[PDB]
Nucleic acid binder design. Structure first.
Lengths: 44, 75, 54, 108, 754, 116, 122, 132, 122
RNA sequence: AUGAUGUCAUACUUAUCCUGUCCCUUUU
């Protein structure tokens, strides 16, 4: 160790902070994974 | 956090000012009372300047219709 | 005799200025040279402005 | 190498009503000896002052460095004071005695 | 656009509905880290607007000049743009009153009017561009140039955040290259050394950074009134044609204060990215500021693991070196955090495409492990509410004993450096543009440097060429030719040597230039000519032709080169002498123009010689002459004309040239050729000249150009003043004598009439 | 510009009642003094029928006082939450409330400050 | 020339009404007298200025009125009396209301017109 | 000047000094005053109150006896490289009784190696005060 | 009238510069083929050697002679000096015209007629 | 229920008017 001593955040250990993945769809077409991926990939 | 950091910065500045006032006084006392005889003794050429205008960007916008290359004439 | 070690202003003729000519001028040769350089720059600027759509 | 309009007198504004002539003399005293200084004690002119120096170039260095200079929370208005305007409140007289003196002492 | 604005609407109502901020404790730690770092560097606070300033009017003229040059270029309007131009002209007429207006607004009005937004489509990745109301834009612009002026006068942003006034791209490329070369015995690994290059965007600093922490950081930067103004005009409103989402979720993108906004956000986030102690050490002692990357002693280069780390606005590039036992420890920490059962660390690593047979990142055990490890550590050390990085999005190459190639992809096109002492791969050097780099102490060729063009920008150039080739039939042929010339003059200059040496990029531009020529031909006729004779396409503008800047081989029609004139006898045909091999048209720069490597070399040489000639002239007590300033006046670093010009008194008091340009790209719609320089501050580097001369010589000159034209038909005397649905017809007639022939259209039979 | 006279305000209210709300270009072609964005801003600021231009109470003052410290900037975000929604009455009320109510060694020190 | 030394009656001659020449202590006027000698002497002596990094009110005045079209930075000297906002308590109110001049000098053309008439009839 | 002619002009190679040097005057083994020589460009000391800015209590010194001005002259450093070095220039202005430095008379138009802590005299014949 | 000659010469030079005149018609074709320039309005304390030293910046003067008057020092205020070439006289008439030299300003113009003792105006 | 003074827009009239200059101040 003794290499990471300037980090403010100690240890996050949380990618999505609910689970590893959601693994669930939804009924609203706007609030879905495909629309979020299309709005985060094609638009920047 | 701002109210607890401003007082800390003021205390650090006061300690640095106290150290500076304790260092500069000792330096002036060491420099004044000397141990060895303290008190016992371009035109640049005007034709090169302002040879062209300016203050613009050179590439006015991005419209590819102003013929930006070949700034000089032909013959 | 020869000139001193001063900077003589040019007026399209290298003259033999002597007898301590330390900056004796009215400001006519330098203003004319600056006006000539400004005209030579403004001609190219107007040509580039008129060659915008051509 | 100076503009003619500037004069030995400077109008200075954006002053507090509590301000002390000690701070005044100290600060302004950088550039040269003070001829004198006036301060408005009157309802409208309170907050304003006039500074006059033994020399103009004093005032020139002053307005140079003192331009928009700070006191308390304020950035003082520093301008070269005008001339003429309201003068004739006083008169031209009392020349006779002094001129008689210079005509007497040196005899010229 | 309607969908993504609805998405921002939902996120903003969410982030106000839940109050779900950025984890208050971590926020307090970040604010404390910032306060401590700024105190350690001992930066002065930024003074609010000095009302009688020597800085004031000069700064206002510079900012209004930039605002005018963007908002008006040439002969377009609106009514909003009209009121903007009018207020601009009024400011340039009564300047002190305008400075009064700006000061009163910036100290008073902590509100804002409704801003405008509609995205523009560089069809690969859409990048939305916001518009503001007029007088608010002017006031904010003077504030922005003020903020950058006092920032550069205070040296507050470090030399870490390097996107500023060295140059645009090529200098940063050559700088990071030679800096990676001249590290202390770093390309060697015989005692099991290892190195790693990372590249990852922080990927949320357009929609994360919270207003209150921004206000506190701005309070630590500048005075209270300017802080409130920056925060408030960060908060306005966004209305596209119908919908109207509120604001204040995070920062608005295109407002003019974004320079200091995103740069201080980078200065904050980079400290918590690296570490305070190592960032201070690699930054500078506050007395002696440090150079482009150059650390002071050998010792601070030796102590920390993470050697050098720079950034442009969105990239971050950190050549994190690691000693071997630390590498084993890091791999152990990585596997213990994230156990891999079936060696699935190599299940998906991104890599490059630069002939990926001998110089992709050679995926082996400890190397792939070290890569996923360094990303795990930099991910875990990131302030997880605001700034993350995606292991799908990054690209982390490792130069060790195993993968003897190393591929770091800066703001330019991607770069490959492969030292001789590791006995590298082929790197065939398709052009003479191999990135050489001399070891700084030994003056020795420590490494070679290949540099191929990058795929994202290559597809962007192809996209814009398809945009032009799809914009036909609604414009004249002259505008199509001008746009193709514009795009080629860009994309052969800023990716210069890579455009010479990346063979797929050389091939794509060739077919696209022939494609645009095909579009011009199918405009000229309708029946797709058997051989459109190459003169009236590729010939120069002022002599009545289309002026394609052709960066592709095309031999001339060898029989289309005859001069003919009836002097005192009769016909004296005067053909060209092109039996050498075949007359090429002319080579898009490449050999014609100079490379950026030799440009950088001679730039250092010329600036050193100009300063030494200035020293000698100050000795001999003479003014420097036009002869010695013409012995240079090339470019050296920036430009010698940038010492000569009127800006030498005028435009010294602005910094932040390139950063202002990139924000201007996000600020106005015309996706210009504008990253690569900005002429006034940088100068004139894109130097055509000799090119038009050589094309006239190749086309046989005017003698042959007029011969293929109908210029003899007017029977006016000689070559003189010749030049001055309409313009297509003028082109049609002035080259009708070459565009009307059976050879140029095979099946001809018509006699028109009369 | 934008003096917002009463005869122009009545004409803007009549144009908002007659033409509509989501048509700003149709309302700007019958005034000859302001643009469409200025007319929409006036209709959303002073000519809105849901704007509470009076009745400043102590509950709204306590709501605005308990909101300016949680968010110092972004007064437009607290415009519809407080209930004023005029984007200028909130700043005026904040100015009125501010004017009426006006009329390592460091730690080692504190450590010995408790031990002494 | 204009640098010739002056007298206290001559001093009272220049400045307008309502100012005092009261000094501070009896140890600063002697500094002003040595200042001449010390303009040479203390300029040849130790001196310098520096700044420290520390976190941080700002008063100021433009023209205080309903509109009051703008004042050039110099014209303040003339129009300073208008800047102060003290209002509504004789002749002092006639000089104070006479700043309509300022409306004639700087402003919009209509302000100049209407102002001009208003001062004609007064 | 204000009321007299101005002689002893400096050359064009004059510059502002940046070295650590201060005028330590000791008339009675006590440095009461201190004058900065690197802050000002010109410095005139004499027996007149109209020409000079501050008077001096030396009756055996003329109005124009010595002129100590700092200027970067053509010299060589210790490493051997040429450049600009801020050093004081010592040359006599043609006084009626001359001058003496460290009990030795110096002639004009001769580039002498002037350094700090030199025992000089600010008068034509003698002086009871030295500067360091 | 006494000092309006230098102002008239400067106005003629400004009109020739602003009217777009070339070098062939720049008020030199009428005063050509003669290097004798007429100087008038000099100070009464200026000697011939000082004027020859101040007028040598544009070239060496061939024959200079001051206006002799009042048998005591030959001082009248006028001076006549012939330069080497006509270009030096043109540069002196274009640069040293209307300049101030030791208090009162002098005038520089060309006569190009002959050598006369009494031709200037006091 | 006119009228009064008053800060402040809005229409209307004058067939109002857009190349005016030092061709004159030449003062010691």
């Amino acid at each position: 160790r003794r290499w990471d001593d300037d980090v403010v955040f100690k240890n996050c250990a949380k990618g999505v902070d609910d689970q590893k993945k959601d693994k669930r769809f939804v009924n609203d077409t706007l609030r879905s994974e495909f629309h979020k991926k299309f709005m985060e990939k094609y638009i920047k | 956090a701002d109210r607890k950091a401003r007082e800390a910065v003021e205390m650090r500045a006061q300690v640095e000012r106290k150290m500076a006032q304790k260092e500069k006084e000792k330096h002036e006392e060491k420099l004044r009372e000397m141990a060895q005889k303290a008190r016992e003794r371009v035109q640049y050429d005007q034709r090169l300047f302002n040879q062209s205008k300016g203050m613009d960007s050179g590439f006015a916008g991005g419209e590819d219709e102003i013929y930006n290359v070949y700034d000089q004439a032909w013959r | 005799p020869r000139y001193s070690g001063p900077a003589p202003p040019p007026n399209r003729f290298w003259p033999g200025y002597r007898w301590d000519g330390v900056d004796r001028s009215n400001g006519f040769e330098q203003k004319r040279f600056a006006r000539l350089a400004s005209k030579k720059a403004v001609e190219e600027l107007a040509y580039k402005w008129s060659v915008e759509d051509m | 190498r100076l503009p003619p309009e500037v004069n030995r007198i400077l109008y200075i504004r954006n002053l507090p009503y509590k301000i002390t002539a000690e701070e005044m003399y100290d600060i302004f005293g950088k550039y040269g000896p003070i001829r004198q200084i006036r301060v408005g004690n009157t309802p409208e002119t309170r907050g304003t002052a006039y500074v006059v120096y033994e020399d103009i170039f004093d005032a020139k260095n002053a307005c140079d460095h003192l331009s928009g200079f700070n006191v308390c929370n304020r950035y003082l208005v520093v301008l070269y004071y005008n001339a003429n305007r309201a003068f004739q409140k006083m008169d031209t007289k009392k020349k006779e005695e002094q001129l008689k003196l210079l005509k007497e002492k040196y005899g010229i | 656009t309607r969908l993504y604005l609805k998405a921002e609407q939902e996120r903003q109502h969410n982030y106000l509905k839940d109050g779900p901020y950025i984890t208050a404790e971590e926020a307090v730690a970040v604010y404390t880290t910032t306060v401590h770092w700024l105190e350690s560097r001992r930066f002065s606070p930024i003074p609010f607007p000095p009302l009688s300033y020597k800085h004031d009017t000069k700064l206002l003229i510079l900012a209004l000049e930039r605002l005018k040059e963007a908002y008006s270029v040439k002969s377009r309007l609106n009514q909003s743009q009209r009121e903007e131009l009018g207020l601009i002209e009024q400011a340039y007429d009564n300047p002190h009153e305008a400075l009064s207006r700006i000061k009163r607004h910036l100290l008073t009005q902590r509100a804002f009017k409704e801003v405008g937004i509609e995205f523009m489509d560089l069809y690969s990745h859409l990048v939305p561009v916001y518009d503001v109301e007029p007088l608010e834009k002017i006031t904010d612009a003077y504030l922005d140039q003020y903020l950058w002026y006092e920032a550069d006068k205070r040296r507050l942003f470090p030399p870490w955040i390097k996107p500023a006034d060295t140059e645009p791209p090529p200098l940063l490329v050559y700088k990071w290259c030679q800096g990676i070369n001249n590290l202390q015995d770093v390309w060697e690994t015989s005692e099991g050394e290892c190195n790693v290059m990372l590249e990852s965007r922080f990927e949320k600093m357009y929609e994360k950074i919270d207003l209150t922490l921004l206000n506190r950081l701005l309070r630590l930067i500048v005075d209270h009134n300017i802080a409130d103004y920056m925060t408030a005009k960060n908060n306005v409103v966004i209305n596209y044609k119908d919908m109207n989402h509120t604001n204040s979720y995070g920062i608005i993108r295109g407002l003019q204060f974004a320079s200091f906004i995103v740069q201080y956000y980078g200065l904050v986030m980079d400290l918590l990215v690296l570490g305070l102690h190592r960032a201070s050490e690699m930054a500078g002692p506050p007395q002696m500021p440090n150079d482009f990357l150059s650390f002071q002693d050998i010792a601070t280069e030796a102590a920390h693991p993470i050697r050098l780390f720079c950034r442009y606005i969105d990239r971050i590039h950190i050549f994190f070196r690691f000693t071997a036992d630390e590498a084993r420890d890091l791999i152990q920490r990585y596997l213990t955090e994230h156990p891999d059962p079936n060696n699935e660390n190599i299940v998906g690593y991104n890599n490059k495409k630069c002939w990926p047979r001998d110089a992709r990142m050679r995926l082996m055990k400890h190397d792939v492990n070290l890569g996923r490890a360094v990303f795990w550590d930099i991910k875990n050390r990131l302030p997880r509410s605001v700034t993350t990085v995606q292991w799908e999005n990054s690209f982390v190459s490792v130069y060790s004993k195993d993968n003897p190639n190393l591929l770091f992809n800066m703001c330019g096109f991607e770069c490959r450096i492969l030292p001789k002492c590791r006995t590298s791969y082929e790197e065939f050097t398709h052009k003479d543009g191999v990135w050489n780099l001399q070891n700084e102490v030994t003056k020795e060729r420590t490494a070679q440097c290949f540099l191929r063009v990058d795929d994202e920008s290559m597809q962007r150039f192809h996209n814009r060429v398809r945009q032009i080739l799809m914009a036909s039939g609604s414009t004249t042929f002259t505008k199509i030719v001008n746009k193709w010339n514009t795009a080629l003059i860009g994309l052969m200059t800023y990716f210069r040597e890579a455009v010479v040496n990346t063979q797929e990029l050389l091939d794509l531009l060739v077919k696209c230039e022939n494609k645009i020529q095909t579009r011009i031909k199918i405009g000229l006729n309708s029946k797709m000519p058997s051989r459109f004779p190459p003169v009236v396409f590729y010939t120069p503008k002022e002599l009545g032709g289309l002026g394609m800047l052709s960066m592709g081989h095309v031999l001339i029609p060898q029989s289309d080169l005859r001069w003919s004139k009836q002097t005192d006898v009769g016909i004296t045909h005067f053909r060209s002498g092109m039996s050498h091999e075949e007359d090429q048209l002319i080579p898009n720069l490449y050999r014609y123009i100079q490379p950026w490597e030799s440009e950088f070399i001679d730039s250092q040489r010329v600036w050193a010689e100009y300063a030494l000639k200035r020293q000698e002239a100050i000795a001999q007590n003479r003014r420097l002459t036009l002869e010695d300033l013409e012995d240079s006046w090339d470019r050296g670093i920036p430009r010698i004309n940038t010492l000569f010009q009127k800006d030498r008194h005028t435009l010294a008091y602005d910094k932040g040239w390139r950063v202002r340009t990139d924000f201007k790209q996000y600020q106005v719609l015309k996706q210009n050729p504008f990253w690569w320089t900005h002429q006034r501050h940088d100068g004139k580097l894109w130097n055509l000249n000799n090119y038009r001369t050589d094309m006239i010589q190749a086309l046989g000159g005017v003698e042959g150009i007029l011969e293929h034209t109908l210029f003899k038909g007017t029977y006016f005397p000689t070559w003189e003043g010749l030049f001055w649905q309409i313009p297509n017809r003028r082109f049609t007639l002035w080259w009708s004598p070459t565009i009307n022939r059976a050879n140029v259209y095979v099946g001809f039979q018509v006699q028109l009439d009369l | 510009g934008g003096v917002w006279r009463n005869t122009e305000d009545e004409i803007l209210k009549a144009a908002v009642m007659k033409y509509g709300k989501n048509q700003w270009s149709r309302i700007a072609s019958l005034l000859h003094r302001k643009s469409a964005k200025q007319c929409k801003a006036r209709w959303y600021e002073w000519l809105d029928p849901s704007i509470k231009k009076t009745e400043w109470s102590r509950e709204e003052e306590e709501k605005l006082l308990h909101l300016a410290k949680l968010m110092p900037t972004q007064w437009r975000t607290i415009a519809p939450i407080i209930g004023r929604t005029a984007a200028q009455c909130l700043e005026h009320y904040e100015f009125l409330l501010d004017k009426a109510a006006q009329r390592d060694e460091l730690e080692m020190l504190s450590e010995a400050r408790a031990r002494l | 020339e204009r640098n010739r030394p002056l007298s206290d009656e001559e001093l009272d001659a220049m400045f307008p009404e309502g100012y005092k020449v009261l000094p501070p202590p009896a140890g600063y006027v002697p500094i002003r007298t040595p200042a001449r000698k010390l303009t040479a002497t203390p300029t040849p002596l130790g001196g310098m200025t520096g700044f420290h990094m520390q976190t941080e009110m700002k008063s100021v005045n433009d023209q205080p009125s309903g509109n009051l079209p703008f004042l050039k930075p110099d014209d303040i000297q003339y129009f300073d009396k208008l800047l102060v906002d003290v209002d509504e308590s004789e002749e002092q109110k006639e000089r104070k209301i006479m700043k309509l001049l300022l409306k004639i000098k700087n402003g919009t053309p209509p302000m100049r017109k209407a102002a001009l008439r208003q001062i004609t009839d007064k | 000047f204000r009321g007299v002619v101005i002689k002893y002009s400096e050359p064009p190679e004059a510059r502002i000094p940046k070295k650590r040097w201060r005028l330590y005057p000791f008339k009675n083994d006590e440095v009461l005053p201190v004058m900065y020589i690197h802050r000002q460009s010109a410095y005139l000391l004499g027996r007149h109150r109209r020409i000079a800015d501050i008077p001096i209590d030396h009756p055996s010194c003329s109005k124009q006896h010595a002129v100590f001005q700092y200027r970067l002259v053509e010299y060589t450093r210790a490493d051997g490289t040429v450049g600009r070095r801020v050093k004081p220039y010592i040359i006599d202005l043609g006084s009626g009784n001359g001058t003496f430095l460290n009990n030795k008379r110096i002639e004009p138009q001769r580039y002498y190696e002037l350094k700090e802590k030199d025992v000089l005299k600010f008068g034509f014949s003698s002086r009871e005060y030295v500067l360091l | 009238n006494p000092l309006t000659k230098v102002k008239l010469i400067n106005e003629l030079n400004e009109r020739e510069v602003q009217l777009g005149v070339a070098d062939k018609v720049s008020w030199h074709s009428e005063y050509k083929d003669s290097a004798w320039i007429f100087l008038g309005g000099l100070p009464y304390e200026l000697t011939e050697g000082d004027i020859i030293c101040v007028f040598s910046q544009y070239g060496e003067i061939v024959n200079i002679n001051l206006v002799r008057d009042k048998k005591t020092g030959k001082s009248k205020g006028f001076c006549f000096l012939c330069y080497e070439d006509q270009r030096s006289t043109i540069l002196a008439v274009d640069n040293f015209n209307g300049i101030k030299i030791k208090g009162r300003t002098i005038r520089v113009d060309h006569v190009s007629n002959y050598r006369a003792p009494k031709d200037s105006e006091e």
